[model samples]
Target chain A: DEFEMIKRNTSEIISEEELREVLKKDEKSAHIGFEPSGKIHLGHYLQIKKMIDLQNAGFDIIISLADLNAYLNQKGELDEIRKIGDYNKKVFEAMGLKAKYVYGSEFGLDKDYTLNVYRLALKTTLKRARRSMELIAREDENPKVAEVIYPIMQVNNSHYFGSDVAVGGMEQRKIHMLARELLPKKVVCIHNPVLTGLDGEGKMSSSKGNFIAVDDSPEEIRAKIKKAYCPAGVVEGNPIMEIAKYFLEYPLTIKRPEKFGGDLTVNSYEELESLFKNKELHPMDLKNAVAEELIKILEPIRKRLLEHHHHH
Target chain B: DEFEMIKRNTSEIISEEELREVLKKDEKSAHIGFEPSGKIHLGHYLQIKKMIDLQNAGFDIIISLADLNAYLNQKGELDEIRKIGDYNKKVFEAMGLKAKYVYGSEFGLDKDYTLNVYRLALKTTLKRARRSMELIAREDENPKVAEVIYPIMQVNNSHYFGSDVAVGGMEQRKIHMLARELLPKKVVCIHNPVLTGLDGEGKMSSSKGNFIAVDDSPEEIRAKIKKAYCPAGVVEGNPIMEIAKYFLEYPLTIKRPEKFGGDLTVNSYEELESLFKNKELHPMDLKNAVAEELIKILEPIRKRLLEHHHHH
Candidate 1:
């Protein structure tokens, strides 16, 4: 039952069987790490939600705020990078996924962690290491040495955490797979779907401005959803449809005028998909309903963020 | 002058003006690093002798034993690599130079040192970092990510301990110049010529066996010199001619049979260079005299090594 809850929203477990084996442990821990970003968005929320599910399944959670990694990748200056990490941590706490939060700087330079990074770098080929950066790296065919060093450090962080389960978006598969080979300990991976961008381009990213920040204002959320790409009678690559299933709680209720089709209460994603694809629900109605659910989900997070900021 | 003493026998002084500024410091430190190798050869001894010169000119010496680096570069296993580092420290001592010896494992994992390495990795390009390895890296055209990381750590090590001047073979110029730009502190570099291989291939290296081990037996020394690449009256890229100037004592004596040329004593490298270039000294006679000087230079060091080994 716990396995089912933890596995519910993931794209795939690197191995579900190994996960079950880990579920047998009395004391277990799982981890996910994030780079320092100015905005904590739905993409981050997706992973944090999964980590909460894991915690509910009796695993202690660890959130690695990758401040040093971001700094190394030239995200920002060191002090400013750490500030963004602190803000990101507050946002995660506001979203109700409370666990031990760690800054990558805290152990990024630890002796064992660094030596392990170098050790793996020696054996990991440039071609293989560069392959892992294809989708997520900067928009350049010719990447820097930092691109290759990134994954080695990321995988080594899993070892440093002593994490039995590492949870991340599907883009992390390459590095998590590398952990299986390179780390001293065995680690199972839970890969979640990378949230589609509102522009219908690719993955949601803060730099692209195609994401709904976890702490986005109610007005901001409404405006973002209003402009999100959702084609009528089409489900594939529809950001709105994906958000409806993943973000909104089912029996989700739609609010609309009687002429448009009186507000319908959908019981599950399957029911919503059939009705929406069959031309029963208009795109406008879907977007509005999605916005309502997101505002509901994010309003308190926004409030808590302001409160945390004020306290700081 | 103190500057002349420290400046003697170097390929270049990076910036003679900056070196002069550093030489004015009341408390200055100089450093050189070595990777774990099966034997320390004249390549190492050349750098060590220069470090000793810097020490005599009022610079405190710091010797970095690159245990972790060798292991990362696949020199050996960790324990084995560290053991070789200890043996290397003994050999450096046997050669009559005393300094503070630091192992890479000592601070290879330290917070500041590790962060500095990552910091430079962000700014250093793959081409720039990889270029530093051209002379010193392995034979493979396809190098690993570890190859790039090697120089950053080496440069960062200069910053880690605050070395005012870094002494190394000419192969280190790219990295030394990188340290000047990337490190917070400006470091002057004393680049010495890389010793040519006895086989006339390229640089002398322990792996290639084209080297005279600092602790090689008297007979082995003579044999290696006897077979070394020294063509008749050819001084260009001549290992024998290079060693005579760098390794042997001046006011040299070459003994030969009475029929050939009895015995001649040369006072300086300039004097010997002219005689050798003119074909006045026969190649065999020069080889024999070079071997004699080497035997004299190494005999005490070998005795000290045996004494230390016995104590161990």
Candidate 2:
């Protein structure tokens, strides 16, 4: 069930059988690593939660600080890259996912194993190079060649850090696909869906629209949830349902009373999925329930950020 | 007349005032250089003849043995490049264009000065990159990037050799243009017309038919000349006429006998030009005269080759 919980949170629709193979790795003490390139968004937080769970399961969590990827993606803005790295580091500490972190820019040059991914990316065709450009351009304009190589560097970092399992949002599938091809014959890759923003057209993008941050106060979350997109009987594709399915690890399901026109018990993922898909439940009900759960999850994290923000 | 001579040789055409300025300089030295990618053929002899004429005109001569360019153009075949270089050295010796010679691959790894040319060429755009590719592809198939870089390497050699004037064929115009752009403001450039092969179609190519080699005997020269494309030009466009105009310094106008034609006696180039332009003189007569004179000029060089063969 621990592995099952992880698979549901990390991958959108993966089989229980697939989850077993990933957990049956050769090394027990090895880490699940992810390189941090941009600011740690909620999508990133979901992945960090998996590493935290894996750490509690007795694996040594190794978070490689991919300063080189940050610098490369920032397009010669080394200082800007370092600034984002610092913010992400703080987020990791706040979320209680803190463990060993190594900055690649410092280590790679010192170790003489720093493959300049930008130069390597040039060996690829123009069409293949466009994939990374499309993703980064969603956040920033006029990306450089180095930015195009960022996904590759992140994939390389997983192997470099000796990660048994690598994790990120489902949009990072390109990096995972590349890792499957290029990484040493052994690493397993896992990906989670993006947190759909409160006003949901798509994923929660800080660059695009207003969304409640994990560090938001109680009043802010209430206001954001009231303004959130949750049309009746659209709970299957609703943003709130996604968060509940991914973020909560209770009995791996939450039962609702029969008064809400549902079953007396939600025993499995299939039951919840069928309810939402059949339009047996409305989105307003799901959004209301998720808002309360999210508040509970972020309370302690918000407290730590307040304390740490004052100290810094 | 000198201006007219320079104008007629479109490959080497430069203003008369610029020529006077170059001649005024302390005539340090002059050389005609080549990269030997293959067997030394008649196409190469035109520049060799130019070198000899410069040598006779009280200037030291150099016949640079471009082993590096050959290796680059021929793709890492240093031994083959060197073999071709050695064969060309003998050809120059046979033609009595005895002068200083140098090999390029002999410079080895410390060829930083030469290597800088390749580095500069890399800074040029893809369109400019194709120019060198086009030139080298004329001599080899699917040439390596080194072949593409070879032209820049050759242009640097002119500056490296410190020649007052450099000579090469029309095919080398792009390389010479690069040299003109890169060399110190003081160096002068003098290119030669690309001689046609004995078939007189397209530019003279050693890779094809009827190339009258410098090693050809007087009988061989006559046979090759008879087969050459001497069109029914009154004077100008015929290959034989062009060859005589370029290779011979003598006043080639013949005094017309009253019995053969009109009593007009043609003594100078103008007098013969008027006769030919007026269609008073037949192109067949000019071809026969050019073929006979070409044998006379080639006879001395052919005997020298025979004498050198015996001595060696």
Candidate 3:
């Protein structure tokens, strides 16, 4: 029946009913995770929240440290790499996720019988390794083959550790798709939404300073949210509204005085959608309200992070 | 002129005049060595004697223990291999050879950068490695690539240890040629005659069980010599007579009874070579006399080996 719905709804957006119907076939046993090459900023929060929600819905979760990838890609300090990896783990734990953890170094160390795997892990052909990561660095040439092998190593580890599912943001869809082809048939894959930058043109990244970290203070969060370029009536294109849709999964109600908008009420996503779609809500009012709601939703997480760090 | 002579010769053989000319031009600074792959048989004896003669002629000498080659070629314990390697060293010392000794294991161990060198050591193409051992193995296809690399490793060590004059039996001509090619310009290479089997086809080897060991008892040596296939009249194609010319270095003196054949005497190499080329000496007479002279020469060396073993 789930297959039938997916097959039938070829033209329409997938309804929740269709998704639930598909879920009844067989529960997902596999878990997917990501390696944080850098700090986990606001761009990471939506994906982490989504993974936590899936885990609560009874799916296994995995978070690969990918220290090797970080080492090769970021070319950063080893001690800092490990610390950041642990920090990512703590953030996932704070989000109420019980993800299985694996480090690239550990995976590499386990394969002692032959150097074939190591060579394969490090040895990609010259051409493919150089693809640009424009969001991170505007370098002319891509990484070398050794740098490109990091994704392969992670994918290989996923198969080696025997996972049935892999998950990552759309930014990693290329590697995910490749893993699906390269790994054995036992594993399936899922891709989540990419968090757009504040300008709505590219990915949100720490390097660009376009992201608010999950552990940001209230003042920092407020400042970022207030300055964000999210037009209200155009909620479809707004970064804040997009986050509310993917991260909150909550129906928000907006109220306005008669003088400003004639006591307008948006009690459900349908009502809000209609109001925003019809330009009934002004852009500034929606943006201001979305920023307040985002602050309220993220305050507790930031406080917990601060208290945890103080204890440490 | 010496350079011209070396350029003209592809097989590493040098005439006495050529050797004299080379010495007059510049003092020989380099030494060449051979690996005793098996028992110290007749081939090894001739090669060792040639090396000793080279040492006496004011050239440095290097005797290398080819342990890695032994590992690749023979299926045996390391102890047995060491024993086989030591047997030749004992013979060399007994025969009063003053030469530097080098073992492959020691060389490889001292290098200590095993990982990289091991990979690079296997860098040669199969075709090139096979060609290096062609003369000794005679296009044998059943041997492993490691065995083929044995000769190459020897050649590499020759250059690595800095040899000025390389010497070995004719069976090693191909590899010696390779060594000369790979080493710096002006390194001299000399090929001595390879001892043949009792059946008079190709070089003697322990694998074929046709070789006469220097350690063989007098009676065993005499019996093996008697069984050697040297036909009468023609000495040109006789393996035993060839041994006499190379090993004994006898300016030919062949005695005969009137009932058998007439006496023939030649004092110098030119007269003996002229006579032998003209078929003046009978193969049977040459073989018989050469066998007697070999026994007399080997008597002291054999006695020393017996005493060393008996004392132990």
Candidate 4:
């Protein structure tokens, strides 16, 4: 049952047996690493919820606020990136996720860690390392040498953190696969589905402004979800439907005016999907319900983060 | 006149203007770096002789015993490579090269040096970095990431050593060009010609054992030269002629029995080339004369290195 809870809503687990063994340990631990961002959004919240699920299932959680990676990626200066990392830490705490938070600089500059990086570089091929970064690397006509080193650093993180299970979005699958192949110790990978952008072009990203911030006000949430790409009777890649599928619970209820099928009740996601695919529910109604549910879910997080900011 | 002497016998100067300006400074420094080798051969002597010339011209010389690069290149373990570095230092001293010798690990692993390496990596493209190592990288079916970082470390060496002019053999031309382009301060590059192997297939290398170590015994020198690749009436890429051109001072004497040309004396390399080209001097006589001259030239080095080893 604990394994099922840990497996819930994940895109893939590298190995079920390894994860089962990890769960059997008296002291289980898992980690998720994030390059500090100026804005923490719903996309990040998806991962936070998974971390919470793991925590509830008795796994100690470790969150790596990768400020060094942010600086290497040219996000900002060290101080600026660390400031963003501090802000992100508060937001994660506000989301009710309990974990030991670590900064990359806390251990990335250790002599042993630096030596391990050079050792891995000596063993890894440029072709393989470059391929591992296909999804995560910043687009450049001429990619920097740092682009190749970034994935190796990520692989090193798995070992340094002593993680039994590493969690990330599907975009991290290739890097995780590389770590599994190269790392001496075994680390199971759990990949969660990537959240779609509001405009439906690609994944939701803070830099592109295609995401709803976790602390977005109620009005902002309403505006974003209303304009989100959601075609009638189409569930595939529909942001509204994805939100409902992940955030909304079973026995869902949709209230409407008398003219348009007074009310709708679904016992499970499968039932809701069947109704939507048959054109039984309009896109407008679905958008309205999803927005209201998200606003309700995020209200406490918004309040706590704001209060934390004020106190600081 | 001193500057002319410093410029003599070099393959190319990156910029004559930069070199001229460097020569004008009251206090000047130059450096040449070598990855520690098991055998110190004529190839290394060429650079050492150039350093001697610079020392005569009032330039403070710095020699980098690149143990880390040797370790990265898989020459040997660190302790083993460092032992070879210490041995190489004595050989250079025996060759009458007087300058400050710094091991790579002396400043290479410093926090600033390591940070600068990562900073340069962030700005350098994979394509550009790989191109810099085309000639220097060891031929491998799957080259490691260390191959690319080698050049960057070399570039960093110029800055750390405070070199006004960096001296190296022609094989280092591309890496010097990269350093000239990327380093914040201008550092002049002086490239010397590479020595042809005794077998005349490629450049002389220690691993191939197709070289005459500076510390070789008189019998070993004579035996190797007697069997060297020397075609009669051919001077181009001929190992014997190259040795004469680099090692022998003008007005060189060739001693022989009465049957062969009893004795020949040449005042310049051009005269020797002219005689050899016209079939006036036989290859056998040339090999014998060059072998005798080389043994005479390297005798002091052999004695000093052996004495140093014994004392240790």
Best by TM-score: 4
Q: Scored by Cα lDDT, where does model 4 land?
A: 0.86
Off by over 4 Å in 4: A207-209
**lDDT by residue for model 1 (A1-312), tens:** 999999998999979999999999999999999988898888898899999999998899999998777775668788998888888888889889879999987887777777778888987877777888776566554456787898888888898899989999998898888889887787999999988999889988885559999888888888999998898989999999989878888887788899988979899988889988998999999988899899998888988888777886
For candidate 1, write residues B86-129 as lDDT tens digits: 89999998887989999987887888778777777877888888
Whole-model alpha-carbon lDDT for candidate 1: 0.86
Cα error, residue A86 of model 4, in Å, equals 1.9
A160-182, model 4: which lDDT tens digit per residue? Answer: 99889999999999889888988
Clashing residue pairs in candidate 3 are: A130-A142, A232-A283, B30-B164, B30-B165
Poorest stretch of ten by lDDT in candidate 2 chain B: B118-127
lDDT (CA) for every model shown?
0.86, 0.59, 0.58, 0.86
Fraction of the real A/B interface contacts present in each candidate? 0.74, 0.00, 0.00, 0.59
Interface RMSD of each: 1.8, 9.9, 12.7, 1.4
- Give candidate 2 regions above 4 Å deviation: A1-6, A12-39, A53-76, A107-123, A131-164, A179-187, A208-212, A249-282, B1-312
- Candidate 2 C-alpha error for residue A149, in Å: 4.5
Model 1 spans > 4 angstroms off:
A138-143, A207-209, A299-312, B25-27, B140-142, B207-209, B309-312
- Scored by lDDT, model 3 comes in at 0.58
lDDT of 2 by residue, A163-227 (tens): 65666667766656665565554556566667787666777756433466667778766667766
Ranking by lDDT: 4, 1, 2, 3
Q: How high is each candidate's TM-score?
A: 0.91, 0.50, 0.49, 0.96
- Tell me which of candidates 1 and 2 scores higher on TM-score: 1
Model-by-model DockQ, in order: 0.57, 0.05, 0.04, 0.64
DockQ of 4: 0.64
Error of 3 at B13 (Å): 6.1
